[PDB]
Write an enzyme that holds these catalytic residues in place. Structure first.
Site, PDB file in Angstrom:
ATOM      1  N   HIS A 148      12.596  -1.176   6.758  1.00 31.29           N
ATOM      2  CA  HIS A 148      11.403  -0.343   6.708  1.00 31.29           C
ATOM      3  C   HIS A 148      11.373   0.778   7.756  1.00 31.29           C
ATOM      4  CE1 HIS A 148       7.395   0.827   5.546  1.00 31.29           C
ATOM      5  NE2 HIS A 148       6.954   0.638   6.775  1.00 31.29           N
ATOM      6  N   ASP A 171       2.957  -9.904   7.722  1.00 33.51           N
ATOM      7  CA  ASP A 171       2.624  -9.007   8.822  1.00 33.51           C
ATOM      8  C   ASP A 171       1.655  -9.770   9.739  1.00 33.51           C
ATOM      9  OD1 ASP A 171      -0.125  -8.693   8.082  1.00 33.51           O
ATOM     10  OD2 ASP A 171       0.488  -7.262   6.523  1.00 33.51           O
ATOM     11  N   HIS A 231       0.831  -1.200   0.000  1.00 31.90           N
ATOM     12  CA  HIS A 231       0.000   0.000   0.000  1.00 31.90           C
ATOM     13  C   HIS A 231       0.870   1.256   0.000  1.00 31.90           C
ATOM     14  CE1 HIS A 231       0.804   0.895   4.314  1.00 31.90           C
ATOM     15  NE2 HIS A 231       1.007  -0.414   4.350  1.00 31.90           N
ATOM     16  N   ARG A 259     -17.138  15.491  11.097  1.00 33.89           N
ATOM     17  CA  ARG A 259     -15.755  15.701  10.629  1.00 33.89           C
ATOM     18  C   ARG A 259     -15.306  17.151  10.877  1.00 33.89           C
ATOM     19  NH1 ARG A 259     -14.422  12.153   6.362  1.00 33.89           N
ATOM     20  NH2 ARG A 259     -12.235  12.867   6.397  1.00 33.89           N
ATOM     21  N   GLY A 278       3.032   5.268  10.387  1.00 35.29           N
ATOM     22  CA  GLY A 278       1.695   5.778  10.109  1.00 35.29           C
ATOM     23  C   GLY A 278       0.991   6.354  11.329  1.00 35.29           C
ATOM     24  N   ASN A 333      -1.251  10.869  13.459  1.00 34.92           N
ATOM     25  CA  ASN A 333      -2.260  11.235  14.448  1.00 34.92           C
ATOM     26  C   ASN A 333      -1.921  12.591  15.079  1.00 34.92           C
ATOM     27  OD1 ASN A 333      -3.835  11.391  16.955  1.00 34.92           O
ATOM     28  ND2 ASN A 333      -4.502   9.311  16.413  1.00 34.92           N
ATOM     29  N   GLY A 373      -0.597   0.521  15.516  1.00 33.42           N
ATOM     30  CA  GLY A 373      -1.206   0.822  14.232  1.00 33.42           C
ATOM     31  C   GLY A 373      -2.326  -0.156  13.902  1.00 33.42           C
ATOM     32  N   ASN A 413      -8.921  25.248   5.073  1.00 32.37           N
ATOM     33  CA  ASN A 413      -8.198  24.543   4.021  1.00 32.37           C
ATOM     34  C   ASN A 413      -8.436  23.032   4.136  1.00 32.37           C
ATOM     35  OD1 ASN A 413      -6.208  23.138   2.539  1.00 32.37           O
ATOM     36  ND2 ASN A 413      -4.620  23.612   4.081  1.00 32.37           N
ATOM     37  N   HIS A 440      11.499   4.973   7.517  1.00 26.05           N
ATOM     38  CA  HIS A 440      10.624   5.816   8.314  1.00 26.05           C
ATOM     39  C   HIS A 440      11.467   6.827   9.090  1.00 26.05           C
ATOM     40  CE1 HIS A 440       6.535   4.728   7.769  1.00 26.05           C
ATOM     41  NE2 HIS A 440       6.666   3.470   8.148  1.00 26.05           N
TER      42      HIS A 440
HETATM   43  N1  LIG Z   1      -4.461   9.353  12.504  1.00 24.00           N
HETATM   44  C1  LIG Z   1      -3.959   8.145  12.888  1.00 24.00           C
HETATM   45  N2  LIG Z   1      -3.919   7.766  14.185  1.00 24.00           N
HETATM   46  C2  LIG Z   1      -3.441   6.575  14.599  1.00 24.00           C
HETATM   47  N3  LIG Z   1      -2.941   5.657  13.754  1.00 24.00           N
HETATM   48  C3  LIG Z   1      -2.914   5.909  12.413  1.00 24.00           C
HETATM   49  C4  LIG Z   1      -3.429   7.186  11.895  1.00 24.00           C
HETATM   50  N4  LIG Z   1      -3.272   7.164  10.555  1.00 24.00           N
HETATM   51  C5  LIG Z   1      -2.706   5.975  10.226  1.00 24.00           C
HETATM   52  N5  LIG Z   1      -2.494   5.235  11.336  1.00 24.00           N
HETATM   53  C6  LIG Z   1      -1.910   3.873  11.370  1.00 24.00           C
HETATM   54  O1  LIG Z   1      -0.784   3.753  10.501  1.00 24.00           O
HETATM   55  C7  LIG Z   1      -0.702   2.380  10.099  1.00 24.00           C
HETATM   56  C8  LIG Z   1      -0.057   2.266   8.730  1.00 24.00           C
HETATM   57  O2  LIG Z   1       1.308   2.618   8.927  1.00 24.00           O
HETATM   58  P1  LIG Z   1       2.326   2.675   7.682  1.00 24.00           P
HETATM   59  O3  LIG Z   1       3.691   2.921   8.263  1.00 24.00           O
HETATM   60  O4  LIG Z   1       1.744   3.640   6.666  1.00 24.00           O
HETATM   61  O5  LIG Z   1       2.287   1.196   7.009  1.00 24.00           O
HETATM   62  P2  LIG Z   1       2.802  -0.192   7.683  1.00 24.00           P
HETATM   63  O6  LIG Z   1       2.065  -0.285   8.991  1.00 24.00           O
HETATM   64  O7  LIG Z   1       2.377  -1.254   6.679  1.00 24.00           O
HETATM   65  O8  LIG Z   1       4.303  -0.075   7.850  1.00 24.00           O
HETATM   66  C9  LIG Z   1      -2.113   1.819  10.115  1.00 24.00           C
HETATM   67  O9  LIG Z   1      -2.078   0.583  10.836  1.00 24.00           O
HETATM   68  C10 LIG Z   1      -2.931   2.873  10.843  1.00 24.00           C
HETATM   69  O10 LIG Z   1      -3.714   2.325  11.912  1.00 24.00           O
HETATM   70 FE   LIG Z   2       5.482   1.646   8.084  1.00 26.62          FE
END
Ligand SMILES: Nc1ncnc2c1ncn2[C@@H]1O[C@H](COP(=O)(O)OP(=O)(O)O)[C@@H](O)[C@H]1O
Ligand SMILES: [Fe+2]
Length: 567
Positions: free
Chosen positions: A115, A229, A15, A450, A311, A315, A169, A529, A119
């Site tokens: 990975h 995963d 993704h 929202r 990810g 937040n 996550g 915005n 990051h």
């Molecule tokens: N606003 C947010 N608050 C908390 N967690 C978030 C938010 N946005 C995305 N995530 C988390 O980020 C994760 C994805 O992380 P990412 O690093 O993009 O990919 P991966 O987990 O495959 O390495 C998802 O599991 C999601 O729950």
């Molecule tokens: Fe990641």
């Protein structure tokens, strides 16, 4: 010249495919696949178009690259979870950069970067700070969901990791799915959390300590050996647990033929608003766990500067609170905290390994495609629509905004990441008490609950926000000062929190000018915005994209390049 193309995205189970080009430590180009393909989340695909764009933008071919960098240790993942890495570097290159799009005399050096390193790289090297604590909080890298590291002297050194089964996550995703908002919309969950009340932040699952958390709901060493995963494993554990302890069962998706739209539309059995207390509680549990982790790495490294990526780094609500912690002086989180950012991170890691210095992002994320006036005209003249070329566009747009109209704004180079930052934005009055409902219900046809967020001149943010710092990415909540806590109803919460973008003239002269002109109309150079898209479609990228979304929504005007279209 050192030229490193960083990538993310792969055909098998991936993704957020993206592509970033570093040239001499500078960002030459950066794009997310979804923006160009128009397919949300850039799923199951090499970043073909995004890389093509990077190369075109910089006038390069693959033969001009010193290195191709990929933001996962794919060979490792294929070894442990699939029984072997079958690809030669050349074969892997053929998949990441298909020859029919990317002709090449020879293979560039291919680097797979771990990975979380990527990051972390995407935070540290681009922060403009020379050392700090690194907190990576994720779904899951190859084997870990959290990484704590020390960033100093251009080096990133790991202190500890947390196994994927314990992923914050995945947890947050699962709750997001459970509520019917969907695992692909955690940001929505955050939005919803603000409307709920937290009862038991442990969820009877988490036990919090001063260094983070522990999750007794699941054995931390639980592997889903099938996949690579622990998503499925955590998904069962969390869904069964939530159904046990929470008054509502999983919300279900409902797929029915809607005669009004002429198709099967997906809906939810219950209104996800009903789950607000569960959101609040999940949000609070995430924050608590993350506060622990932050304190822990900060103190283990003796830094007061914090770097966050992964990810969960998206937040903003949790980040705002990290910022105000006593353990934190300064904070940097890149607009590409999620996986889209690991193409850039992989590139930076490699470029650094090749002797480059990485320049700071510097208060802008506008690294995507831009379009000449002639190109915009071509898209306009395609539609047979009438349009003007205002003497002073930035002033006219400001006037429309001040009058309570909604204006699509498509200028310069697309921003990267989930947040519109005034390159591809829908703009409206930050001052209107009805604007929030208007945009939500009438314009984007999204959920009434929202929230919206403001852009403002950096030059007045000290008078507006309780913190005098840069907030270039809307990646952090902060509180407004007293004199503005009721002036800006559409973009400020009752508790005085907001999620701001501060705007330097260097970052975005046009946006900066527009805001300035707005200030001369309504006192404050502040506007609403919001992302420029119809819901579920990715932020518009091309002028044809902008015109299409403009045509389908009751927006008042489109400012695309130097041209202005009205309804
Ligand atoms: N606003 C947010 N608050 C908390 N967690 C978030 C938010 N946005 C995305 N995530 C988390 O980020 C994760 C994805 O992380 P990412 O690093 O993009 O990919 P991966 O987990 O495959 O390495 C998802 O599991 C999601 O729950
Ligand atoms: Fe990641």
């Amino acid at each position: 010249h050192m030229r490193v193309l960083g990538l993310n995205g792969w055909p098998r189970d991936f993704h957020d495919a993206s592509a970033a080009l570093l040239v001499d430590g500078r960002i030459a180009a950066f794009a997310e696949e979804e923006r160009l393909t128009r397919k949300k989340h850039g799923y199951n695909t090499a970043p073909v178009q995004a890389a093509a764009f990077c190369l075109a933008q910089a006038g390069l071919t693959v033969d001009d690259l010193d290195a191709v960098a990929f933001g996962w240790d794919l060979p490792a993942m294929y070894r442990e979870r699939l029984g072997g890495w079958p690809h030669s570097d050349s074969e892997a290159l053929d998949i990441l950069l298909p020859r029919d799009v990317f002709p090449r005399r020879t293979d560039p050096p291919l680097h797979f970067v771990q990975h979380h390193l990527a990051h972390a790289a995407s935070a540290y090297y681009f922060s403009g700070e020379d050392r700090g604590a690194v907190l990576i909080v994720d779904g899951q890298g190859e084997e870990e969901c959290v990484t704590l590291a020390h960033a100093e002297g251009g080096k990133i050194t790991v202190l500890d990791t947390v196994p994927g089964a314990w992923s914050l996550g995945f947890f947050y995703e699962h709750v997001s799915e459970y509520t019917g908002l969907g695992g692909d919309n955690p940001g929505k969950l955050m939005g919803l959390a603000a409307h709920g009340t937290t009862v038991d932040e442990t969820l009877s699952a988490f036990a919090f300590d001063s260094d983070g958390y522990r999750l007794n709901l699941i054995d931390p060493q639980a592997r889903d050996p099938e996949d690579w995963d622990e998503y499925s494993v955590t998904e069962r554990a969390w869904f069964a647990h939530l159904e046990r302890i929470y008054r509502l069962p999983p919300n279900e998706f409902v797929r029915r033929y809607d005669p009004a739209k002429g198709r099967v539309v997906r809906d939810t059995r219950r209104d996800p608003y009903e789950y607000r207390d569960l959101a609040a509680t999940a949000q609070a549990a995430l924050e608590r766990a993350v506060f622990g982790l932050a304190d822990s790495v900060l103190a283990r490294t003796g830094e007061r500067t914090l770097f966050v990526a992964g990810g969960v780094g998206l937040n903003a609500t949790m980040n705002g609170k990290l910022l105000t912690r006593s353990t934190v002086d300064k904070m940097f989180v890149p607009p590409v905290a999620s996986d889209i950012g690991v193409s850039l991170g992989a590139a930076a890691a490699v470029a650094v390994e090749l002797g480059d210095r990485i320049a700071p992002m510097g208060d802008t994320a506008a690294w995507g495609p831009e379009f000449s006036p002639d190109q915009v005209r071509a898209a306009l003249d395609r539609t047979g629509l009438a349009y003007r070329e205002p003497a002073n566009l930035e002033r006219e747009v400001a006037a429309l905004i001040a009058s309570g109209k909604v204006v699509g704004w498509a200028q310069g180079r697309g921003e990267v990441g989930p947040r519109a930052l005034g390159q591809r934005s829908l703009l409206g009055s930050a001052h209107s008490p009805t604007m929030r409902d208007h945009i939500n219900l009438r314009v984007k046809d999204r959920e009434w609950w929202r929230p919206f967020a403001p852009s403002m001149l950096r030059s007045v943010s000290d008078q507006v926000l309780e913190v005098d710092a840069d907030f270039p990415y809307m990646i952090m909540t902060t509180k407004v000062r007293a004199a503005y806590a009721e002036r800006l109803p559409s973009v400020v919460h009752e508790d005085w929190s907001t999620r701001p973008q501060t705007v330097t003239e260097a970052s975005n002269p046009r946006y900066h000018r527009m805001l300035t002109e707005l200030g001369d109309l309504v006192g404050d150079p502040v506007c609403l915005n919001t992302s420029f898209n119809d819901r579920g479609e990715p932020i518009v990228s091309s002028p044809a994209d902008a015109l299409l979304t403009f045509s389908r929504l009751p927006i008042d005007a489109l400012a695309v390049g130097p041209y202005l279209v009205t309804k």
